[PDB]
Amino acid sequence: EDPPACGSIVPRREWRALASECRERLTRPVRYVVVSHTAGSHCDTPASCAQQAQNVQSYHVRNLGWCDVGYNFLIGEDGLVYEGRGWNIKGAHAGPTWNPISIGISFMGNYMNRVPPPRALRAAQNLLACGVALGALRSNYEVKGHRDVQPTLSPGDRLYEIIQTWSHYRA
Amino acid sequence: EDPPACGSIVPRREWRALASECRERLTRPVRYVVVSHTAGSHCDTPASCAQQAQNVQSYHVRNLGWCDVGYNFLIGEDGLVYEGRGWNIKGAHAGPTWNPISIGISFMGNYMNRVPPPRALRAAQNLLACGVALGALRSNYEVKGHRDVQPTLSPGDRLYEIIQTWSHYRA
């Protein structure tokens, strides 16, 4: 209802989220940031992307039995960031090694043969700064591709080549 | 050499902006911020908003013969900031008293009957703290309504009513 934080981040409630049940929390400041893709439906507007946020959560919650959507945060091709578990709650995105020691951000869509727009890329890099600001992220935080931590195609071939160029990226 | 940026803003190049002919600079840091509306057509998509910025810039340049779009920054219902004159360049939005000592933020639309969606309000508010971060605005900056410093409905009653509630607003 009332958000005055960085990253013009769409709040759980603005995208009609179901409430988290998650309790495990991250020991801050976190060092690792894991970039993924939903491998789900792409969305270019905030109407579409809020619905799409709902869809990802619903599947993780109703279907996979999870306490909440698995991603710390979700990025839409509308250029907005979507709050999931947020800065404090341990995510479920990178398996047991990398879930507790990292934050996971997920681009909404499959980027194997697509590239995401600059706005979405910005929204992401902005998100990371905002996290270091709030001391959620270590100043010298490191960025990993989902596929650098787990055997997956996530975050997609095209998106993966983008993030290799980032100053904070480590393979 | 200066370290990394703040905020997420749709650059001029990206919303297909004509080049600026403006040379007059503002004196950093800037004490004031004036909030207007376009009293124009609104847009809830990155795609339609990028067009509306064009249309506003266009009218300002082509019909009014201004050096650029008047406002330093524009806000889309899409939840994105759209770059105008930016931080360092005096603008054309609040007349000669106010134009030399203020940043002018317009919301793309007409907020007389409609309200702006929270993603808009979030963007604007975040932008302002970026200004502070960067040292473009003063830490003790001050937000003003357009109607507060000229005889205008702008930024519109609904929006006016809202911006009054902000922490930095001084009638």
UniProtKB/Swiss-Prot annotation, chains A, B:
Gene3D superfamilies membership: Peptidoglycan recognition protein-like
Principal subcellular localisation of the protein: secreted
Q: Where is the N-acetylmuramoyl-L-alanine amidase domain?
A: 28-156
An example GO BP is: negative regulation of cytokine production
InterPro entries per record? Amidase/PGRP_sf, Amidase_domain, Peptidoglycan_recognition, PGRP, PGRP_domain_met/bac
- Cysteine disulfide partners in this protein: C6-C130, C22-C67, C43-C49
Entry keyword Signal: yes
> What compartments host this protein?
Secreted; Cytoplasmic granule
- What's a Gene Ontology MF term here? peptidoglycan immune receptor activity
* GO CC list: extracellular region
Q: Which CDD domains has this protein been placed in?
A: PGRP
- Assigned keywords, A-Z: Antibiotic, Antimicrobial, Disulfide bond, Immunity, Innate immunity, Secreted, Signal
Its assembly, as annotated, is: Homotetramer.
Which family, according to the similarity comment?
Belongs to the N-acetylmuramoyl-L-alanine amidase 2 family.
Function of the molecule: Innate immunity protein that plays several important functions in antimicrobial and antitumor defense systems. Acts as a pattern receptor that binds to murein peptidoglycans (PGN) of Gram-positive bacteria and thus provides bactericidal activity. Forms an equimolar complex with heat shock protein HSPA1A and induces programmed cell death through apoptosis and necroptosis in tumor cell lines by activating the TNFR1 receptor on the target cell membrane. In addition, acts in complex with the Ca(2+)-binding protein S100A4 as a chemoattractant able to induce lymphocyte movement.
Q: What is this protein called?
A: Peptidoglycan recognition protein 1
Query: What is the originating organism of this protein?
Result: Camelus dromedarius
Q: What gene does this protein come from?
A: PGLYRP1
